[PDB]
């Protein structure tokens, strides 16, 4: 009843151009079986959304990578938020919600916006730049480590650590094995910075530790919650901002609409998250036998959710393969959905909005003018290099 497919959604050929295979995954049925990895796959919008909103059956506490924590040892201690189900999830989630709250955004917005404006002006003085190294990476590196309260020493480990984290949710392919092997120096740096003495008062990390006084988290939970922000809060934004710039470079008509109304910046960023889906996939594990789209899945099975596919499903989206900065984006699953929906979404949107606002006000054209290179990761979609010429407004 369930179709069996040989598509490897973690192969380099798939990463290089996933769209035909994602349509094959959607059109084969609401649920497929991926023989390459012995997992179920769910690629249409409706079923992806339903699974994400059914946490008592499609759980996170057995891991959201391929590995099942009831069968294998996790490569690092489990995340107290990502890899937990309610009720254990709830209080750690509340702490990160408050640390990354609407009220907190007020305290960082001026500096985040000023840094974005300055970066765009700096890049305009160069003209021809690499929108990854010089923009998508440089901007978050200039604001997020400081907002976390990290010391200066060791920050070179942050992007390597995040790449490792995101590769490690994948299957045990070469990308994963290479990432985990000799990763101890990156782990040691991150784990050290999670300790309270290393985090500047007033930053996100110190604020997490301050919540240990309230009874929401114990002192020994705080370092792992700092670890969550250092795992999930940098490389995601690099790929989100890179996605938005790549969209504006390829759709000049949409750049022109953004220039004419810079208040579209926030939705232009949200649409880039839908369109590229910088976080492509994650897993759940069934806690019981369950029917999904007519297919019966046994207990203890891994289920792979294709967020990028759901975000392009023609059953749900008109003109899904068009980047449209005025699209009604609500309901896209690029930040997930339900109880685990990205707790950092306000930080992500703040960074994306202020960068696109700076581009909207300062740049007249974005032209690809060198070889584009894709970056491969088991979970993240994005570019390694994006040479562009920026023309000033
Ligand atoms: C464009 C940028 C981002 C994207 C696309 C993104 C995507 C996601 C997705 C899809 C999830 C859900 C995972 C699941 O359901 O298993 C998630 C969760 C999470 N994200 Fe983000 N994220 C982004 C930025 C950030 C930032 C900036 C932070 C922190 C500063 C952050 C921290 C987290 C955390 C801690 C979780 C776990 C939440 C929970 O399990 O309750 N993310 N993110
Ligand atoms: O708590 C953490 O360490 C953590 C939290 C969230 C993420 C994340 O966005 C993500 C994880 C797995 C798959 C797709 C996205 C990764 C790590
Ligand atoms: Cl670690
Ligand atoms: Mg260890
Ligand atoms: Mg010291």
Q: Alpha carbon 39 to chain centroid distance?
A: 22
Distance between Cα 197 and ligand 5 center (Å): 7
Give resolution in angstroms. Answer: 1.3
Q: What atom of ligand 2 comes closest to residue 82's alpha carbon? A: 1
Q: Rounded to an integer, what distance in angstroms lies between the CA atom of residue 182 and that of residue 228? A: 21
Rounded to whole angstroms, the Cα distance separating 291 from 162 reads: 35
Which of 88, 92, 166, 225 should be mutated for ligand 2, with most atoms under 8 A from CB?
A: 166
**Among candidates 78, 22, 48, 94, which has minimal Cα distance to 305?**
48
Residue 226 near residue 243, CB atoms below 8 Å: no
Our measurement of the distance from residue 359's CA atom to the centroid of its chain's CA atoms, rounded to an integer in Å, reads 22
Q: What angle do CA 27, 31, 32 make, to 5 degrees?
A: 80
Annotated binding site: 89, 93, 284, 340, 342
Give the pair of three-digit tokens for residue 301: 């099975």
Helix axes 265-276, 345-362, angle to 10 degrees: 120
> Both tokens of residue 109?
């917005």
> Which tokens go with 216?
């929401």
Q: Could you give the CA distance from residue 269 to residue 388 in angstroms, rounded to a whole number?
A: 19
Minimum CA distance residue for ligand 1 atom 9: 335
Distance CA 108, CA 111 (A): 6
- Sheet containing strand 32-34, strands side by side: 4-5, 32-34, 39-42, 302-306, 281-286, 58-59
Beta-carbon contacts of 389 under 8 Å, excluding residues fewer than 6 positions away, are 127, 128, 365, 366, 367, 369
Binding residues for heme b, as ranges, are 89, 93, 284, 340, 342
Parallel/antiparallel/unpaired status of strands 295-297 and 4-5: unpaired
- Span from the CA of 75 to the centroid of ligand 4 (angstroms): 6
Q: Verify cis geometry, omega within 30 degrees of 0, for the bond prior to 332.
A: no
Mutation pick for ligand 1 pocket among 89, 108, 344 (CB with most ligand atoms within 8 Å): 344
Instruction: Give residues (CB < 6 A) around ligand 2.
Output: 64, 79, 81-82, 165, 169, 227-228, 231-232, 236, 279, 282, 379
Q: Which residue has the tokens 């045990």?
A: 172
| HSE, side-chain direction, 13 A CA sphere, residue 54 | 18
- Ligand 4 centre distance from Cα of residue 77 (Å): 7
3-state SS of the chain is: CCCEECCCCCCHHHHHCCHHHHHHHHHHCCCEEECCCCEEEECCHHHHHHHHCCCCCEECCCCCCCCCCCCCCCCCCCCCCCCCCCCCCHHHHHHHHHHCCHHHHHHHHHHHHHHHHHHHHHHHHHCEEECHHHHHHHHHHHHHHHHHCCCCCCHHHHHHHHHHHHHHCCCCCHHHHHHHCCCHHHHHHHHHHCCHHHCCCCCHHHHHHHHHHHCCCCCCCHHHHHHHHHHHCCHHHHHHHHHHHHHHHHCHHHHHHHHHCHHHHHHHHHHHHHHHCCECEEEEEECCCEEECCEEECCCCEEEEEHHHHCCCCCCCCCCCCCCCCCCCCCCCECECCCCCCCCHHHHHHHHHHHHHHHHHHEEEEEECCCCEEECCCCECEEEECEEEEEEC
Structure tokens at 38: 């012995």
User: Token digits for 269?
Assistant: 């960023």
Which residue, among 311, 387, 377, 385, has the nearest Cα to 160 in the 3D structure?
377
Closest CA to 82 of 71, 93, 73: 93
CA 151 to the chain's CA centroid: 24
Nearest residue CA, atom 12 of ligand 1?
Answer: 336
Relative to beta strand 290-292, strand 302-306 is unpaired
- In 3D space, the residue among 46, 38, 3 whose CA is nearest the CA of residue 24 turns out to be 3
State how far the Cα of 316 lies from the Cα of 320, in Å rounded to an integer: 8
As a whole number of angstroms, the distance between CA 261 and CA 275 comes to: 20
Say if CB 1 and CB 294 are below 8 A apart: yes
Q: Which residue puts its alpha carbon closest to atom 17 of ligand 2?
A: 232
Q: Which ligand is nearest to the CA of 274?
A: 1
């Amino acid at each position: 009843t369930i179709p069996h497919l040989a598509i490897d959604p973690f192969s380099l050929d798939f990463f290089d151009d996933p769209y035909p295979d994602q349509q094959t995954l959607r059109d084969a049925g609401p649920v497929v079986y991926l023989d390459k990895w012995n997992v179920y796959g769910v690629a249409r919008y409706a079923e992806v959304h339903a699974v994400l909103n059914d946490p008592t059956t499609f759980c996170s506490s057995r891991g959201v990578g391929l590995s099942d924590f009831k069968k294998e040892k996790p490569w690092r201690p489990p995340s107290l938020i990502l890899e937990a189900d309610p009720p254990a999830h709830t209080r750690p989630r509340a702490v990160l919600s408050k640390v990354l709250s609407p009220a907190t955004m007020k305290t960082i917005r001026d500096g985040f916006a000023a840094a974005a404006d300055a970066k765009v002006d700096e890049l305009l003085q160069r003209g021809c730049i690499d929108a990854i190294a010089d923009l998508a990476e440089a901007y978050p590196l200039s604001v997020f480590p400081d907002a976390m309260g990290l010391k200066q020493e060791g920050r070179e480990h942050l992007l390597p650590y995040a790449g490792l984290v995101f590769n490690a949710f994948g299957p045990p392919n070469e990308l994963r094995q290479t990432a985990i092997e000799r990763s101890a120096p990156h782990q040691a740096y991150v784990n050290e910075q999670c300790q309270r003495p290393n985090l500047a008062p007033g930053g996100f990390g110190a604020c997490i530790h301050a919540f240990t006084d309230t009874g929401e988290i114990t002192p020994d939970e705080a370092p792992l919650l700092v670890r969550s922000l250092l795992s999930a809060g940098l490389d995601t934004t690099v790929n989100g901002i890179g996605a938005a710039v790549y969209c504006l470079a390829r759709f000049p008509g949409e750049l022109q609409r953004l220039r004419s109304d810079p208040t579209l910046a926030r939705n232009a960023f949200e649409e880039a998250v839908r369109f590229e889906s910088p976080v492509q996939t994650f897993f759940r594990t069934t806690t019981r036998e369950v029917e999904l789209g007519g297919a019966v899945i046994g207990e203890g099975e891994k289920v792979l959710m294709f967020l990028g596919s759901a975000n392009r499903d023609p059953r749900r989206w008109s003109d899904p393969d068009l980047y449209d900065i005025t699209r009604k984006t609500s309901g896209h699953v690029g930040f997930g959905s339900g109880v685990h929906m990205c707790v950092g979404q306000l930080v992500a949107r703040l960074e994306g909005e202020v960068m696109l606002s700076a581009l909207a006000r300062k740049v007249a054209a974005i032209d690809i003018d060198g070889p584009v290179k894709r970056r491969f990761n088991n979970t993240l979609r994005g570019l390694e290099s994006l040479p562009v010429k920026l023309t000033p407004a």
